[PDB]
Amino acid sequence: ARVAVLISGTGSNLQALIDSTREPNSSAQIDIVISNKAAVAGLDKAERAGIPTRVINHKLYKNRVEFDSAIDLVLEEFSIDIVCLAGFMRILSGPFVQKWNGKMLNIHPSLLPSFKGSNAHEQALETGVTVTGCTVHFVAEDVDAGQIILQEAVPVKRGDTVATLSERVKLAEHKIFPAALQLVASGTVQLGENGKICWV
Ligand SMILES: NC1NC(=O)C(CCC[C@H](c2ccc(C(=O)N[C@@H](CCC(=O)O)C(=O)O)cc2)C(O)(O)C(F)(F)F)C(N)N1
Numbered sequence: 534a535r536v537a538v539l540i541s542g543t544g545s546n547l548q549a550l551i552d553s554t555r556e557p558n559s560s561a562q563i564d565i566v567i568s569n570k571a572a573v574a575g576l577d578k579a580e581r582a583g584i585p586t587r588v589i590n591h592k593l594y595k596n597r598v599e600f601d602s603a604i605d606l607v608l609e610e611f612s613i614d615i616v617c618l619a620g621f622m623r624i625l626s627g628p629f630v631q632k633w634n635g636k637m638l639n640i641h642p643s644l645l646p647s648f649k650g651s652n653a654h655e656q657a658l659e660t661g662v663t664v665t666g667c668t669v670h671f672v673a674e675d676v677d678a679g680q681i682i683l684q685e686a687v688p689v690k691r692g693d694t695v696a697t698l699s700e701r702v703k704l705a706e707h708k709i710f711p712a713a714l715q716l717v718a719s720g721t722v723q724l725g726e727n728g729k730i731c732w733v
Pocket of ligand 1: 621641649674678
């Protein structure tokens with residue numbers, strides 16, 4: 534399968550995907566990396582791996598549909614089969630999500646359905662959980678609410694900050710996101726017609 538990764542930042546998740554798709558027997562190759570933000574490290578990581586990049590600045594579009602269409606143009610240009618959102622921070626429009634249904638994955642730093650949204654670690658700390666984790670899910674229109682592929686629990690330590698908790702959870706993310714990508718790229722895991730995840 535030909536894979537695009539969308540990013541908005543550091544790209545540590547991207548890096549783990551690059552590394553895993555180049556291990557032997559991979560069913561995926563990363564063919565394009567797209568950022569909505571210039572000068573982010575994830576772009577350097579892609580370029581250092583010999584993977585083309587684009588910057589599509591979301592602020593230059595009137596609305597989300599037009600921005601998403603510009604993304605979609607590039608995904609077509611690269612004959613992309615599967616899209617991975619790896620620290621991508623733009624909510625995608627209905628029609629984009631519908632088009633990519635069953636073929637777009639996201640990594641989220643909590644055990645969904647808890648702590649939906651972009652500040653999951655701040656929520657986990659306020660709430661006082663001792664166990665949090667991360668989730669790979671198919672992307673649905675409702676944010677952080679698509680069908681769950683894999684999850685991994687990560688302990689919260691007394692005295693954690695957002696930084697330390699974030700780092701511990703990233704280590705688990707770098708395990709489950711490549712694993713989930715491989716599952717979907719091999720056709721082992723599919724989104725079924727009934728809208729539920731199917732293991733073949
Ligand atoms: N329709 C749709 N459904 C999805 O499930 C997507 C996957 C969501 C990724 C999650 C997420 C949750 C909220 C946002 C968000 O509010 N973005 C704002 C911009 C926020 C900002 O600049 O800080 C904005 O205006 O877009 C961005 C990302 C995430 O919480 O899991 C995390 F971790 F990535 F942040 C998606 N892109 N589109």
